[PDB]
Design a protein around this nucleic acid. Structure first.
Length: 177
RNA sequence: GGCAGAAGCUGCCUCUUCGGAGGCAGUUUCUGCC
């Protein structure tokens, strides 16, 4: 074996200890301001990479793989100090996840609702925040969303997670379920 | 040739009145968009 499920996920947090990786940026300066980036590049340490790969019909992380080879040629680092202890801690990844020989367009309410908006020539719903609460012994997120004439609500730990809990209602409020 | 959104996986950042909260991105599988 020579690859994993993610490879940009390696580059992405080494930036915390190297202060030069994860510098993803545009590849042009005479068109991207119009509406969309339409090509991307990355710089890491003393090197640089681009999304092209062999043809991009291979992966969507050729940009990072082309610069992750420089993370193997790094200095001793005379700045941003670190440690590497052993025989004192142990860890293991999760084993609950699974795979399938097939896929679908409605695996969960959350993806399903987001996927339906694009088929209507939209992008996303009209999400909103309420959080009209703050008791001496109770605090929580309270999301609101609108889709035309109706609304749903949900709970979470940030504005990228309360979207999950509300989506179970988002199909039943407007009659998609 | 090429990008953005959602979920699953990965991990980071800050606050706490001691209930707990607030904030991010990446990838990959679906979709749409270039």
């Amino acid at each position: 074996g020579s690859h994993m499920k993610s490879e940009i996920s390696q580059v992405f947090e080494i930036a915390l200890k190297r202060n030069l990786p994860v510098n993803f940026e545009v590849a042009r300066e005479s068109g991207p301001p119009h509406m969309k980036n339409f090509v991307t590049k990355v710089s890491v340490g003393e090197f640089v990479g681009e999304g092209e790969g062999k043809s991009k019909k291979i992966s969507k992380k050729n940009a990072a793989i082309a610069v992750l080879e420089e993370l193997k040629k790094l200095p001793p680092l005379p700045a941003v100090e670190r440690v590497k202890p052993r025989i004192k801690k142990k860890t293991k990844p999760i084993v609950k996840p699974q795979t399938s020989p097939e896929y679908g367009q409605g695996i969960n309410p959350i993806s399903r609702l987001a996927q339906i908006q694009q088929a209507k020539k939209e992008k996303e719903p009209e999400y909103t925040l309420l959080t009209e609460r703050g008791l001496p012994r109770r605090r929580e997120f309270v999301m609101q969303v609108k889709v035309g004439n109706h609304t749903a609500e949900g709970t979470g730990t940030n504005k990228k997670v309360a979207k999950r809990n509300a989506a179970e209602n988002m199909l039943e409020i407007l009659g998609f379920k």
